[PDB]
């Protein structure tokens, strides 16, 4: 994985690649690493795939119940606190590396969380196997007082660096923009620069090619 987060004027943006590996094999060429914790709090996840989904769904559920209980919109620091305490308790055995971001009544926020339960604050962050490729871009092009359109550009450029240069990352670029006073816009497949070329030949078989021993109608009805 490659995942990033970038702060801008009136909010925050996060992005991710879409590759999912199983050893050296690509299991999913277009998987979603951007998760919704609450409507305006989204999370990018790297590491053990089941762990990032499970831990983000659990905290998201508890955040919803908390939001209903308190009659308030959820805060990013609450999701942050709940996540890190959960991860710390399991001493790193839950391999979830997250970039947590969102907007709430307090303002716009951007954090990262590591598997062992440590958190960090920043204006620009990157996690995953392609984090070094991404961070190189962020360190080269980031500046204070970014606009919305500049931050999306920087974020996707950082993910592309991972896509091209890191073998762990690939395929497409997902983005989510969280601006203050507006609905969060999830941009699934914001960029698709790895389209498979036309094959040289069709491998559609003549019917009856496959040898068959038995046929039978299966009963799915009651």
């Amino acid at each position: 994985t490659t995942i990033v987060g970038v702060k801008f004027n009136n909010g925050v943006v996060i992005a991710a690649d879409t590759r999912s590996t199983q050893g050296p094999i690509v299991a999913d060429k277009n998987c979603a690493k951007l998760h919704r914790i609450s409507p305006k709090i989204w999370c990018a996840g790297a590491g053990t795939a089941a762990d990032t989904e499970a831990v983000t769904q659990l905290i998201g559920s508890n955040i919803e119940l908390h939001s209903l209980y308190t009659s308030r919109e959820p805060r990013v620091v609450s999701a942050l606190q709940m996540l890190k305490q959960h991860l710390f308790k399991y001493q790193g055995h839950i391999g979830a590396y997250l970039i947590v971001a969102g907007v709430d009544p307090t303002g716009s926020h951007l954090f990262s969380i590591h598997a062992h339960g440590s958190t960090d604050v920043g204006y620009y962050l990157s996690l995953g196997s392609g984090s070094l490729a991404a961070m190189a871009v962020l360190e080269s092009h980031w500046k204070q007082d970014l606009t919305k359109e500049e931050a999306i550009k920087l974020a996707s450029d950082a993910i592309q660096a991972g896509i091209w240069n890191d073998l762990g990352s690939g395929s497409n670029v997902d983005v989510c923009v969280m601006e203050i006073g507006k609905d969060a816009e999830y941009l699934r497949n914001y960029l698709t620069p790895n389209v498979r070329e036309e094959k040289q030949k069709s491998y559609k078989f003549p019917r009856g090619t496959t040898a068959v021993l038995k046929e039978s109608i299966v009963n799915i009805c009651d």
Partner: protein, 222 residues
Amino acid sequence: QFNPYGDNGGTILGIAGEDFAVLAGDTRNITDYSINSRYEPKVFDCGDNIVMSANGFAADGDALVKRFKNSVKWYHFDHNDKKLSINSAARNIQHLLYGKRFFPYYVHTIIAGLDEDGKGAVYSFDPVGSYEREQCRAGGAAASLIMPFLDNQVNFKNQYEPGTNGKVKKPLKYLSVEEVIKLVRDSFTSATERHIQVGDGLEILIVTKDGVRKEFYELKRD
């Protein structure tokens, strides 16, 4: 402790026709999750209409090829410029590999050319020198992905004649150079999609009685 071996990834493919033979291989060189080169050739013209590739640990691969090229040179000196037949080259390579039986070259070796009857020939070696002549052979990282596809499309395995109750097999036949290159290109584009160590570029070396021709095709760079 010092580990003298490494894995430079990559995958290679040798197919033999009626009056020709191809030896293909991707141009990507890697270590762990990094890309070292997007274009580093590993299929070589060794002289006497013999093409060769040694895939796996690049340092051992370059050493072996270098030694065989040298072996060809001295065969000419010692035997009045006699042409080294593909079968004689194969036996010679066995002795090169087995000479290091107790400190092996970590490579999968494949050579291609024409036999003494003018028909296409491909030979494949294990790291310690066992060899065999074959119509079709894939080697390297993505060999497991490509090889069963060749079994199906080159040797027509598991394909029976339509209407014959799976009693009459589909007849074996020689393919054209054009049909073979189609299968090679489709083999590598498929492997590129599902194997992280495969991509960047594809270089094919075709061998006919006229000589050795080259063809290059781009692959996905993610």
